[PDB]
Amino acid sequence: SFFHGVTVTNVDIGARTIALPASSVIGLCDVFTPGAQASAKPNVPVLLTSKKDAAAAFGIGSSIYLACEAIYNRAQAVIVAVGVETAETPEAQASAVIGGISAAGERTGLQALLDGKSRFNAQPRLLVAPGHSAQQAVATAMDGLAEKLRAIAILDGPNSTDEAAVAYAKNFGSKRLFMVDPGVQVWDSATNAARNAPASAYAAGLFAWTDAEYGFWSSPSNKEIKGVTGTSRPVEFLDGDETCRANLLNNANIATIIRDDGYRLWGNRTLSSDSKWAFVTRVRTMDLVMDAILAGHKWAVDRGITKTYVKDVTEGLRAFMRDLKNQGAVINFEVYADPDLNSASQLAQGKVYWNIRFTDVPPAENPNFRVEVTDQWLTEVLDVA
Amino acid sequence: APGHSAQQAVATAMDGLAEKLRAIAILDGPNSTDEAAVAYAKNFGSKRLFMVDPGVQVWDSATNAARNAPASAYAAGLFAWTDAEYGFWSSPSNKEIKGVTGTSRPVEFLDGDETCRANLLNNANIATI
Amino acid sequence: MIPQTLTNTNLFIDGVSFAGDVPSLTLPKLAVKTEQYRAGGMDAPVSIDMGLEAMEAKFSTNGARREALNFFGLADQSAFNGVFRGSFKGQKGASVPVVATLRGLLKEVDPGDWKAGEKAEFKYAVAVSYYKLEVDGREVYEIDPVNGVRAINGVDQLAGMRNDLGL
Amino acid sequence: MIPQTLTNTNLFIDGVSFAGDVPSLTLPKLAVKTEQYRAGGMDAPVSIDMGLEAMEAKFSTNGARREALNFFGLADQSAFNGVFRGSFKGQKGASVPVVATLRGLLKEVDPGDWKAGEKAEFKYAVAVSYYKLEVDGREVYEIDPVNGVRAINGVDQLAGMRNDLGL
């Protein structure tokens, strides 16, 4: 049958939680229980769009949707979420997240995030396994995953003391990871108890938010986390303090939260060993201009080489790179073909090279305010005259 | 010969048929794992073959399910298209396939990646999507 | 100096060589927006530079060059890319190339009258944004309106008045 | 590319072939209504598209072609239908047709002076609404003013700015 007319219906909804539509696709991998509500097969990824597909493809109380509501409160973004089956031993529960090619022909675990491209047009530019990154096993094989995807993998330290996560970020010089130590507490809609969320998805949804209107070159350092209470371990930042917990964790290249009730992030520097790639915007503009350079140069990846093939695409690279300098993504650049590495031997097998040399906008980390109370204006001011 | 080219005895005879006609025979690997079609393409060094490994899935007029088409006729229709306005001398690689959804074995191309599924197949001289 | 003239001509649009049909190119007329300035204590004005004006770069073809008709009136302005090649051969042999990259909006497709026995002469016009002239491969002009790049002989002329606007 | 020119010409009006008398066609001059835009932080304006302007498509005949005189000044504007056929034969044989459907108001019938010994040259003019050009049967231009159809190379250019007006 059907209905005609108008149908008012008292339903159970609430808290319209609008966010601007984000473009940067993040990956995701966390456990769930594939019952009758979850219409998603376990080891396969699904293209998520909003809260509804996070509620339809996975469970309501499953650990995917509790991590999908972290990003969809902050940025209406695109999730490539491949869940896993809940295991018993945490040695295998961590190793279920890695997976591999361990099927007959197919893949499983985090290695199904490579299928975001060529299924969804959604290559994950951020990687986050909420909770399953405090282990050494998964976070090593996320840098083994993010180096292939050219992405920033978001991690988290454990729920331990302050120094135990300082020594956990000493195991990586991986120059693409990003560690967020304090775990976000959240309310979860009148459960009257603060659940410790792993706070890797809250920093992941923030990057998709600051990608849209601030741009990818903008540092995601001072900016706000939405849907959050006072976190699990109180991390403060006191000014000029050598032993304050935020500055204790910045020097170990670890992001935190600082403001009251966990408002904003504090990360500017990545989990590297080269100071050349220290910031999280040099490594993000390195890899998010070099897809936009390709997004527009898909024609050049196979073409019959004419005489002007070297010359017409080097004026296509420059004319795209000036549009990044227009919106303030870079400072002045130079793009030019190689006079030394383009011979006749390389043109026969098809290879032909081009140089690109741009420069990042450095973020405003550490503005110093040197100050002095001075009695200079005490004679001219406060006189009889 | 769509579908009937994963057998060895046809693709040997399609190559001998293509040598007589001076043509290009379009083949396809098995729809199995990535290390299976590479072992299939080691049967030939016969310079007239063209192998398209992943199986194209098409929608087919509200079947509400995607059928695994053998993906040899889609790339064979691509050579007829690129023959016309790009000429026969144009490389028929980068160009679009139409009437197609997410394929059988999802082959990506990650850049700077030694073991990505496209580049692992191109060293075995196999076309993909 | 040796006597040096224009002999041959070429046009590329997205790399597509118009080796068949371009009977006329036209580089954009570069001009300074002169404001004649006579003030106190002088006469016979001195014509201060006020920046350039718009640069329309016409050309023509006389076939149905669909590889150039498809750039008219797109929603992406300054996406028409094209270079105006042309070589100046001189008297003592060696030819000095003059190439000129354009980047603008194909703002006019003017098909001429069809008198049934004459040429077609599809007169086109691009109101360019970017303009880069080369002489014998050596750089002479860069004109970029947006973000202010006016570089004569490689050295930027607007750099003295771009770190005061704070661009 | 092969050298390619205009050789012959035809005109149909409501299917009626003017195989006898059309000495001159003229396609409508397509042009973007350029507004030159110089603003803060730049110079040498960049000429944003503001849509096209009106498209008048003249032609001429020199007989009393009553099958074309009866379209002048009707109460049904945009009811004059007519195509401008014309073939471009090239140098290597095959002829590329250029046909061009018009749909407008025959807004001018201009009989020339009658010097008693010369041609007649009834110059006509249609201020067209609809305009569809083809090259070798492949679609290049659709221009429909009302309900906003500007489709270059088959893909509509106004679709990005037609789901925000809510048309």
Tab-separated table of C-alpha atoms in Angstrom, chain A residues 12 31-39 50-70 188-189 191 195:
chain	number	residue	atom	x	y	z
A	12	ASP	CA	13.033	10.050	17.996
A	31	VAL	CA	36.116	-3.389	15.169
A	32	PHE	CA	32.393	-4.071	14.790
A	33	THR	CA	29.916	-6.943	15.038
A	34	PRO	CA	28.414	-7.880	11.623
A	35	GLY	CA	24.896	-8.720	12.727
A	36	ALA	CA	21.581	-8.152	10.977
A	37	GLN	CA	21.631	-4.352	11.311
A	38	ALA	CA	25.161	-3.979	9.926
A	39	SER	CA	24.739	-4.583	6.192
A	50	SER	CA	26.897	10.930	6.383
A	51	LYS	CA	25.641	9.710	9.767
A	52	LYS	CA	22.996	7.586	8.043
A	53	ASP	CA	25.371	5.312	6.147
A	54	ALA	CA	27.533	5.115	9.266
A	55	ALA	CA	24.359	3.942	11.025
A	56	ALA	CA	23.139	1.690	8.213
A	57	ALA	CA	26.325	-0.071	7.107
A	58	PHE	CA	27.591	-0.636	10.659
A	59	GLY	CA	26.001	-1.018	14.053
A	60	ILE	CA	24.746	1.842	16.178
A	61	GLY	CA	26.837	0.873	19.173
A	62	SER	CA	29.679	-0.594	17.129
A	63	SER	CA	33.122	0.981	17.361
A	64	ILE	CA	33.002	2.249	13.763
A	65	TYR	CA	29.958	4.482	14.305
A	66	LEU	CA	31.394	5.807	17.560
A	67	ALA	CA	34.400	6.882	15.486
A	68	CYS	CA	32.326	8.029	12.507
A	69	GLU	CA	30.314	10.366	14.725
A	70	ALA	CA	33.608	12.009	15.692
A	188	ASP	CA	27.099	9.864	24.219
A	189	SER	CA	23.522	11.179	24.457
A	191	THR	CA	24.431	7.775	29.153
A	195	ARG	CA	33.381	7.211	27.500
